[PDB]
Design a protein around this ligand. Sequence first.
Ligand SMILES: *[C@@H](C)[C@H]1/C(=C/c2[nH]c(/C=C3N=C(/C=C4\NC(=O)C(CC)=C4C)C(C)=C\3CCC(=O)O)c(CCC(=O)O)c2C)NC(=O)[C@@H]1C
Ligand SMILES: *[C@@H](C)[C@H]1/C(=C/c2[nH]c(/C=C3N=C(/C=C4\NC(=O)C(CC)=C4C)C(C)=C\3CCC(=O)O)c(CCC(=O)O)c2C)NC(=O)[C@@H]1C
Ligand SMILES: *[C@@H](C)[C@H]1/C(=C/c2[nH]c(/C=C3N=C(/C=C4\NC(=O)C(CC)=C4C)C(C)=C\3CCC(=O)O)c(CCC(=O)O)c2C)NC(=O)[C@@H]1C
Ligand SMILES: *[C@H](C)[C@H]1/C(=C/c2[nH]c(/C=C3N=C(/C=C4\NC(=O)C(CC)=C4C)C(C)=C\3CCC(=O)O)c(CCC(=O)O)c2C)NC(=O)[C@@H]1C
Ligand SMILES: *[C@H](C)[C@H]1/C(=C/c2[nH]c(/C=C3N=C(/C=C4\NC(=O)C(CC)=C4C)C(C)=C\3CCC(=O)O)c(CCC(=O)O)c2C)NC(=O)[C@@H]1C
Ligand SMILES: *[C@H](C)[C@H]1/C(=C/c2[nH]c(/C=C3N=C(/C=C4\NC(=O)C(CC)=C4C)C(C)=C\3CCC(=O)O)c(CCC(=O)O)c2C)NC(=O)[C@@H]1C
Ligand SMILES: *[C@H](C)[C@H]1/C(=C/c2[nH]c(/C=C3N=C(/C=C4\NC(=O)C(CC)=C4C)C(C)=C\3CCC(=O)O)c(CCC(=O)O)c2C)NC(=O)[C@@H]1C
Ligand SMILES: *[C@H](C)[C@H]1/C(=C/c2[nH]c(/C=C3N=C(/C=C4\NC(=O)C(CC)=C4C)C(C)=C\3CCC(=O)O)c(CCC(=O)O)c2C)NC(=O)[C@@H]1C
Ligand SMILES: *[C@H](C)[C@H]1/C(=C/c2[nH]c(/C=C3N=C(/C=C4\NC(=O)C(CC)=C4C)C(C)=C\3CCC(=O)O)c(CCC(=O)O)c2C)NC(=O)[C@@H]1C
Ligand SMILES: *[C@H](C)[C@H]1/C(=C/c2[nH]c(/C=C3N=C(/C=C4\NC(=O)C(CC)=C4C)C(C)=C\3CCC(=O)O)c(CCC(=O)O)c2C)NC(=O)[C@@H]1C
Ligand SMILES: *[C@H](C)[C@H]1/C(=C/c2[nH]c(/C=C3N=C(/C=C4\NC(=O)C(CC)=C4C)C(C)=C\3CCC(=O)O)c(CCC(=O)O)c2C)NC(=O)[C@@H]1C
Ligand SMILES: *[C@H](C)[C@H]1/C(=C/c2[nH]c(/C=C3N=C(/C=C4\NC(=O)C(CC)=C4C)C(C)=C\3CCC(=O)O)c(CCC(=O)O)c2C)NC(=O)[C@@H]1C
Ligand SMILES: *[C@H](C)[C@H]1/C(=C/c2[nH]c(/C=C3N=C(/C=C4\NC(=O)C(CC)=C4C)C(C)=C\3CCC(=O)O)c(CCC(=O)O)c2C)NC(=O)[C@@H]1C
Lengths: 172, 172, 172, 172, 289, 162, 162, 162
Amino acid sequence: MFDVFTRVVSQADARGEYLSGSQLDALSATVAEGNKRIDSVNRITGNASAIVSNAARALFAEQPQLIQPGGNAYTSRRMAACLRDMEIILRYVTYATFTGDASVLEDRCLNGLRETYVALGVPGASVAAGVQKMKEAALDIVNDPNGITRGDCSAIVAEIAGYFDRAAAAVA
Amino acid sequence: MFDVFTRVVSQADARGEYLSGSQLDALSATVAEGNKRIDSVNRITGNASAIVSNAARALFAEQPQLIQPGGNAYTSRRMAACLRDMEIILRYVTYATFTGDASVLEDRCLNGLRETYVALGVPGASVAAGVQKMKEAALDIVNDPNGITRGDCSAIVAEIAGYFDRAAAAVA
Amino acid sequence: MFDVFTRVVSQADARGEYLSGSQLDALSATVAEGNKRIDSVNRITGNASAIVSNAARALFAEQPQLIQPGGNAYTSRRMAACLRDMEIILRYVTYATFTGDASVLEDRCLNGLRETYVALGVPGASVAAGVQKMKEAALDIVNDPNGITRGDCSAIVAEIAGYFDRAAAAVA
Amino acid sequence: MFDVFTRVVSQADARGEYLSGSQLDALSATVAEGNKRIDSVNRITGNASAIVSNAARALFAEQPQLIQPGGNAYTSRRMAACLRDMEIILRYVTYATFTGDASVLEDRCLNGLRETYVALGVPGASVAAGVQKMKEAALDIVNDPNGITRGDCSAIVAEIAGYFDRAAAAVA
Amino acid sequence: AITTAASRLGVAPYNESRPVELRPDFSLDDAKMVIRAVYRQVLGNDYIMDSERLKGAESLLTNGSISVREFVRTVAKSELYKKKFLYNNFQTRVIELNYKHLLGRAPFSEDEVIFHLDLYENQGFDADIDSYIDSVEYQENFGENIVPYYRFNNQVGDRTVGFTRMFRLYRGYANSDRSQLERSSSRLATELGQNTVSAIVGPSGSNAGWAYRPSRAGNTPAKALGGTVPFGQASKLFRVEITAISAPGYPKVRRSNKAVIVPFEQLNQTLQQINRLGGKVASITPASL
Amino acid sequence: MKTPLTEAVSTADSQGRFLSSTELQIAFGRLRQANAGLQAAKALTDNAQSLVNGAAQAVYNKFPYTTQTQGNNFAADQRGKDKCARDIGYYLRIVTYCLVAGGTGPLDEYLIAGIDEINRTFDLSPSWYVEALKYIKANHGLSGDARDEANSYLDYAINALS
Amino acid sequence: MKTPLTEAVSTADSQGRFLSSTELQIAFGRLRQANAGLQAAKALTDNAQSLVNGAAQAVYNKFPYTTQTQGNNFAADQRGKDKCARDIGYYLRIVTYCLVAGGTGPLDEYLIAGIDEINRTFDLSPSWYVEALKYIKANHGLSGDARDEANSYLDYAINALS
Amino acid sequence: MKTPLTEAVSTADSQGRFLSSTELQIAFGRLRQANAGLQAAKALTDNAQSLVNGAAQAVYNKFPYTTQTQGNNFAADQRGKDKCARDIGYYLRIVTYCLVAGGTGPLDEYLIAGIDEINRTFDLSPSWYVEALKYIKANHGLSGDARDEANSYLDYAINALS
Ligand SMILES: *[C@@H](C)[C@H]1/C(=C/c2[nH]c(/C=C3N=C(/C=C4\NC(=O)C(CC)=C4C)C(C)=C\3CCC(=O)O)c(CCC(=O)O)c2C)NC(=O)[C@@H]1C
Ligand SMILES: *[C@@H](C)[C@H]1/C(=C/c2[nH]c(/C=C3N=C(/C=C4\NC(=O)C(CC)=C4C)C(C)=C\3CCC(=O)O)c(CCC(=O)O)c2C)NC(=O)[C@@H]1C
Ligand SMILES: *[C@@H](C)[C@H]1/C(=C/c2[nH]c(/C=C3N=C(/C=C4\NC(=O)C(CC)=C4C)C(C)=C\3CCC(=O)O)c(CCC(=O)O)c2C)NC(=O)[C@@H]1C
Ligand SMILES: *[C@H](C)[C@H]1/C(=C/c2[nH]c(/C=C3N=C(/C=C4\NC(=O)C(CC)=C4C)C(C)=C\3CCC(=O)O)c(CCC(=O)O)c2C)NC(=O)[C@@H]1C
Ligand SMILES: *[C@H](C)[C@H]1/C(=C/c2[nH]c(/C=C3N=C(/C=C4\NC(=O)C(CC)=C4C)C(C)=C\3CCC(=O)O)c(CCC(=O)O)c2C)NC(=O)[C@@H]1C
Ligand SMILES: *[C@H](C)[C@H]1/C(=C/c2[nH]c(/C=C3N=C(/C=C4\NC(=O)C(CC)=C4C)C(C)=C\3CCC(=O)O)c(CCC(=O)O)c2C)NC(=O)[C@@H]1C
Ligand SMILES: *[C@H](C)[C@H]1/C(=C/c2[nH]c(/C=C3N=C(/C=C4\NC(=O)C(CC)=C4C)C(C)=C\3CCC(=O)O)c(CCC(=O)O)c2C)NC(=O)[C@@H]1C
Ligand SMILES: *[C@H](C)[C@H]1/C(=C/c2[nH]c(/C=C3N=C(/C=C4\NC(=O)C(CC)=C4C)C(C)=C\3CCC(=O)O)c(CCC(=O)O)c2C)NC(=O)[C@@H]1C
Ligand SMILES: *[C@H](C)[C@H]1/C(=C/c2[nH]c(/C=C3N=C(/C=C4\NC(=O)C(CC)=C4C)C(C)=C\3CCC(=O)O)c(CCC(=O)O)c2C)NC(=O)[C@@H]1C
Ligand SMILES: *[C@H](C)[C@H]1/C(=C/c2[nH]c(/C=C3N=C(/C=C4\NC(=O)C(CC)=C4C)C(C)=C\3CCC(=O)O)c(CCC(=O)O)c2C)NC(=O)[C@@H]1C
Ligand SMILES: *[C@H](C)[C@H]1/C(=C/c2[nH]c(/C=C3N=C(/C=C4\NC(=O)C(CC)=C4C)C(C)=C\3CCC(=O)O)c(CCC(=O)O)c2C)NC(=O)[C@@H]1C
Ligand SMILES: *[C@H](C)[C@H]1/C(=C/c2[nH]c(/C=C3N=C(/C=C4\NC(=O)C(CC)=C4C)C(C)=C\3CCC(=O)O)c(CCC(=O)O)c2C)NC(=O)[C@@H]1C
Ligand SMILES: *[C@H](C)[C@H]1/C(=C/c2[nH]c(/C=C3N=C(/C=C4\NC(=O)C(CC)=C4C)C(C)=C\3CCC(=O)O)c(CCC(=O)O)c2C)NC(=O)[C@@H]1C
């Protein structure tokens, strides 16, 4: 797994070179965003259960076929697995947000997920819909101006949306 | 695994339906055949060793290439493995008879058996010939009219034949 | 294969639904980006030979084992195949950019490519480095502000970057 | 295992009470010592190999019977084990220093060590002597006034001495 | 057992080995043999660097402070095991590996994935590891004092699908779980989900077609639905798996791996054509009845 | 899917054994029970709509805040009332499966596994379902073996929720 | 207990390593936080009775049937009201422990592990305690890092209950 | 590899948990350290040539037989001198990586793991590298946190060699 810093170090070592001034400046710029990053992780985490449950409620309302008898999310066992998957994805999205690198999301969560859903008949498109609902909910939470030092989080918000979009694409 | 009752249940839950009156009536007819099913299992089991050894002897008589030096059933290790497999296949056929559903035979025994034998160089066609011999002896044992309450076991005998056929078709 | 429009249509037919108002407006927003999308496809296409050859030159400079005698890219036939492959991957990335959907890339290019390379002994990690270099060059060309109507292409760039990321991940 | 903070918490929980203002202030004072504690751990860790080797050298010079043929530290395996134990004990002492509580040292390292040594024939008093030699070297390294912001470290140095003494008694 | 095909399947060295047992009042050489066996088994024959050794756990094993099983447990829960097998893997991959390392077999069913995925998700990695080691299956095969080993041979409680799947996880003796063609990808996600099996392809060196691996999509099904009708007059059908196809070159050659269903009466032509493609036969399996 | 027949084979298989008199007796036990179970399933199925409706009302009377309180998890509106009647219908249907199967298998697989996650996640009180199950026990009109087997499954669900 | 210091040492010990810069940086993180955590703990402790009584009343308001319905699990008598106030006090006191320790360790060890079994066994609604925890979040008057850390622990419990 | 951000996620991932205040504190500890590390990496990089050459000469001075004795493992010819300067360059470069990453990860993965076998196989004395590392410590001219963190990595390498 890589974080924002080790990603650059790994590339540099493969070329046998010191980090250039620009690279050290880019990382310094990343450090200057650290507090916003931490706040975004904290805010998403603090609302984890609501994000997952609301997204799931909305998905089933839009897509009633998922919960009709015989639907993919029917029976407590499958419904539980469905809720579990949404939480797993949200969890690794926060890891990636926290580390500043998507590798943890790709390696632990997304590499092999499409193959799993295809093999089991899980409607990946519907998972992507659910992920998008968690995305919209999460970004609203991260952007709430109230109760926090005011500042510009647009850059961090874009990075997080990238992770959600990456998750959604991987299963669709 | 499924049994005869849980096979119908699983299909009903997949459609969100109570079992129909005819479905329930068919299962009652199954219950009415229960003693014959139990007798058939008991008779095959009580003759298991004879069924296996007689079939192995006949097979090796009809296909002497199997036991000549270099043959796949030659040496004590391989002959023991061959006799074991015949017993295993018989055992699972009886399990399927007992439960009234082929799933235990298919899931635990037959699935992958063709590939296994191909990988090992076991002659699958010869295994099938052995299974057929056990089939004939077992059905004759099941149909023996002596020492039992007389009645028509043609339906049970046909079901058991079907299970032996699945086994023969899977190994080859 | 899907394009950005038919991807959405597919998910709607699966649920038996007319596209929602928000879905139609999302596709309108996609249409509004159409010219930027065409420009990006055109810039990558116009610079294809340089993108590939510069990337290849950088790759073999950083990974000289490839082109030493006995290296996978040694001999004219292997070097030619290697240069061809990089062009193939870039070509399908432009296809995916043009349609706004990864299906063409995933179906026609990346399917079985990892498996092809291992079977032939082609080092996939080194293929992935090549894709990375093409990605870096391609995005700079697409982001070039000279000689074009000024605007924000950040979203198209992110999408293109994503397609390169898929390619790099798939080859190993 | 406890750290300085959770030690107080666990005592309060068993009484079902909130921490007193006096206890909280005691922890605040601990926080004010944090930099000195971190430096002390850093300084011991930075010099660990030297602390162990010099103490072991001094130990064998004073106790040649350990390294004569038949001695407990004679032969490479036993000498190697002896050096390993010295480092383990030092490592755990630094753990205790880092946490501010002896539980890690007591629970993981010392608990049952005397019994192991008695059963093996390892001379506990000689281990204790070795630990004492490591202690003296460690305290001098911690107290070294060069290359560090000047201040009073007598409190942290006293705590570290206590941890070393615990280890010495536990085996002595 | 496995005799004729043992060498080509990479099983012969394990046929030639006995379980590594730590007897009461063991000697130090006994302890060293256990430690070596545990590192090879539980870490999937990765090279282990001196800096990566679990020296404390080794000491406790040598001292009898922990039994073999508790030493296995410690290795399985170590940062070394997790770095090698957890942090970079899809959890289904992790479960595959745990089964291979700690039980010496491959997963039998999707139920095992459900159980261990939920256990990990609800209680964490350590809890999941304990479930393998405290399992009835672990107890029956290895008990307190025997290092886990590959269970190639048929045992009570087995299923046939286990045998074929072991050769999806085990790729030969001079090989490690982290140095296999599929790299980090789950080997069994699809097999488990569909409850299907794959033709066995033995290790490189002893099998020319060792590299055959199917693609994500566009594969040939195992059985010849429709029988010989599409082929005209044909006695029986076979599924041939072919790898390393290169000779015509792109775009005539797209995927170097291909599986074809061909009739008995064209096998001569098929082998001839395959050779001229440069390809190597990975497996041949009857496809009709 | 726990039933007598599949449990019999599971145990024999794990021991590598042919079926013996022990497993045959298990089969005779199932046969003794089966017709009463099927009758019970029929009776419950035929009376399902009355049972499900009555049980839902039983819940509403016991927990009147469910029909008066606003929220996605309550039955104040027709939406929530439909969910609730649906859920009670699931319990009853799956119970009929248990009587057909002759074991908790169907409840274990289709309903009980994961129910605590669902109830927690969607803020549903398991007490609501206990009361629904108690109503069904009090009103299904079964007697003899039919009653006992059915009540065992209703009780099994009740115990899982508590 | 999951605290920064003990976890750092446990991970180092797993690898048989001395502590390094990584763990020293964990310690600086703890030090940066600790004063704020301690200040939060004092503020919650000083206002504990107000917060606990207010939280209990907030639950009674949102869920009036709890003070009106007879039953061991409800607060219709003084017995039940006392249990409820005690429970909320437990949540608050342990949260103060989390602030002192700098992690969820105390909540995990003392309260969260096994709370599901308790709430199920004694038919307590997790929504009751969610409501109390929301009251405490909205009335502790903390600011800055103390607010951030206090709310993370309050949200950790809420998330666990849902 | 061992860095504060990777350890934090690795801990939470092993436990299957969302990140909590413990991990957030770890991040703050990184943030407090990062700029000093980046500043130290820049200073070492800009000074790398002088450091490497100075360190190489310090080794030759302390162990004069290394430039007087014939052998593939010694620096008595230009071939060996280039190897030695190359080697010292690896240590210095990989130490700057640790300063960038905020942990020993780079040293652990790229240099330390297996270094004992290499020094044994090619008959290279660990003492030679310790002297070079000591020279870099004495001459990098860093101060404050830059110095402390940098010296922790240099000593980390020294301890691994001894
Ligand atoms: C976008 C995410 C929103 C946003 C973020 C934002 N945060 C800060 C500054 C700080 N945030 C913290 C966070 C914490 N302190 C703690 O003790 C904990 C609990 C463990 C957390 C999560 C801290 C320490 C700071 C620095 C001090 C301060 O409180 O200001 C900023 C300011 C920029 C900066 O950090 O330099 C911003 C912008 N602000 C918004 O308006 C977005 C909605
Ligand atoms: C085809 C299978 C043959 C056949 C079977 C058959 N059996 C019965 C009846 C019974 N068989 C049993 C069996 C057992 N009783 C025991 O205690 C044990 C040991 C555990 C066994 C195996 C029983 C209990 C009955 C019922 C009582 C009776 O003895 O009759 C029948 C009669 C019809 C029925 O279904 O009950 C039949 C037909 N009969 C044949 O002629 C076939 C060769
Ligand atoms: C990011 C991609 C860069 C960028 C693009 C950009 N392009 C336009 C507008 C137009 N581009 C074209 C393209 C073509 N016209 C042709 O005839 C052909 C050859 C077949 C091509 C490729 C057209 C037709 C337009 C519209 C008219 C115009 O010239 O403006 C825009 C403006 C936004 C828009 O069109 O909606 C932008 C932003 N601009 C940058 O700064 C990036 C480097
Ligand atoms: C919910 C929004 C949708 C849904 C989900 C669903 N998933 C499964 C089954 C599985 N999900 C996974 C996922 C993972 N395994 C991992 O290792 C990781 C990363 C750490 C993830 C995310 C797996 C492996 C399975 C199989 C095992 C299991 O069943 O739990 C199901 C059950 C499918 C079945 O047939 O049993 C479901 C229902 N289903 C929907 O309809 C929603 C759109
Ligand atoms: C001779 C001392 C007595 C005797 C022999 C006899 N043997 C069989 C049948 C078999 N013998 C074997 C033995 C082996 N097969 C091997 O591969 C090897 C290892 C290299 C050995 C030792 C086997 C396996 C069989 C059964 C299968 C086969 O027929 O080959 C028979 C016939 C048994 C039957 O029922 O057909 C006989 C007669 N019998 C005597 O009375 C002699 C005193
Ligand atoms: C006998 C009629 C024929 C024959 C058989 C034969 N089989 C093997 C080896 C194996 N057989 C199996 C089969 C199974 N394993 C299972 O788990 C199941 C269901 C539970 C089955 C059916 C397996 C896996 C093996 C290999 C592993 C093992 O034997 O422990 C052999 C020996 C192969 C060898 O020695 O290399 C033989 C001889 N061979 C014939 O020629 C007969 C036609
Ligand atoms: C010398 C007559 C003139 C010259 C040469 C020159 N060549 C290259 C680059 C390459 N040369 C080759 C040739 C081969 N590679 C093979 O594997 C074989 C067959 C065994 C041959 C003949 C290749 C493939 C390259 C490119 C890849 C590589 O770098 O190896 C260059 C550099 C080109 C560049 O852009 O890097 C040069 C300079 N140049 C002159 O001016 C001479 C008159
Ligand atoms: C001789 C070739 C060179 C040399 C030797 C030297 N050795 C030491 C110290 C030790 N030597 C050993 C070796 C062993 N101990 C054993 O039990 C066995 C196995 C049976 C062996 C091989 C050990 C363990 C030590 C350290 C502990 C001890 O003092 O006994 C020294 C002193 C090192 C010190 O720091 O005190 C010396 C000088 N030195 C040379 O320069 C010779 C060329
Ligand atoms: C050195 C100063 C003295 C000395 C030491 C010595 N110790 C042993 C053997 C063991 N030491 C330990 C201790 C630990 N193992 C751990 O994992 C931990 C942390 C929890 C500790 C504290 C153990 C367990 C052993 C036994 C197993 C092993 O060999 O590692 C020996 C070897 C004894 C023998 O006969 O094999 C020695 C020599 N001996 C002296 O003479 C010095 C005074
Ligand atoms: C050295 C001349 C070349 C080289 C080698 C190299 N090999 C590996 C990794 C492995 N080597 C093996 C081989 C074996 N393991 C065994 O147990 C056996 C005997 C039965 C053999 C032959 C294995 C299995 C591995 C992988 C396990 C592991 O821990 O690595 C590497 C490491 C690669 C990497 O770390 O990424 C290397 C470097 N590399 C060269 O460049 C030389 C040409
Ligand atoms: C270049 C960066 C690397 C490299 C390449 C390389 N590839 C081959 C051979 C083939 N490549 C393909 C690729 C494809 N087939 C498809 O259908 C598509 C998608 C549409 C692709 C990308 C194929 C099929 C082959 C085999 C047929 C052919 O050779 O044309 C080789 C030659 C292999 C050989 O053994 O001769 C090479 C060298 N090699 C490197 O080292 C670079 C990292
Ligand atoms: C009725 C007693 C009370 C009630 C019910 C109610 N339930 C939901 C939502 C769900 N109910 C279930 C239950 C099941 N799904 C299954 O597959 C099975 C097993 C076969 C069961 C038992 C589930 C999973 C949900 C959530 C998903 C879905 O919508 O289907 C609601 C709505 C909750 C929400 O947030 O939308 C309600 C209202 N509510 C009362 O007040 C009654 C007393
Ligand atoms: C005690 C035995 C000796 C001593 C210690 C001491 N240290 C400080 C202050 C600081 N020390 C540090 C330490 C580090 N900074 C880093 O970046 C790292 C590497 C990861 C470390 C180890 C820091 C950050 C400080 C504070 C800032 C500063 O510039 O000083 C003091 C001063 C009081 C205080 O606690 O802040 C003291 C006393 N001083 C001695 O004289 C003893 C020999």
